[PDB]
Design a protein around this ligand. Structure first.
Ligand code: CA
Length: 102
């Protein structure tokens, strides 16, 4: 059973505990959609750790990321923008995937 999506393992505990319920991705992962059931692995070792159900998707830009996006990331907004500047340098167009761990 291959993984459909991966996360940095520093997110694993937040996802399993339900503290992190969205992910913000670039055009590479814009194909996920409400109702998808996805096997999730760690980015570093591809260890499966959960199956998620996508509950909502939306587009977002750097300048329209909100406090509520940050809360759903278990982050402050300033922290979230810094994460995005590191993982998606120079990018401004993103896609929000909201999910629940099954
Ligand atoms: Ca940084």
């Amino acid at each position: 059973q291959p993984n459909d999506i991966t996360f940095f393992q520093r997110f694993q505990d937040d996802i399993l505990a339900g503290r992190k319920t969205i992910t913000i991705r670039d055009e590479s992962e814009s194909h996920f959609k409400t109702g998808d059931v996805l096997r999730v692995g760690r980015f570093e070792d591809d260890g499966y750790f959960c199956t998620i159900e996508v509950t909502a998707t939306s587009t977002v830009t750097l300048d329209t990321l909100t406090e509520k996006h940050a809360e759903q990331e278990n982050m402050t907004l300033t922290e979230l923008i810094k994460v995005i500047a590191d993982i998606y340098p120079g990018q401004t167009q993103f896609y929000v995937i909201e999910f629940k761990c099954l």
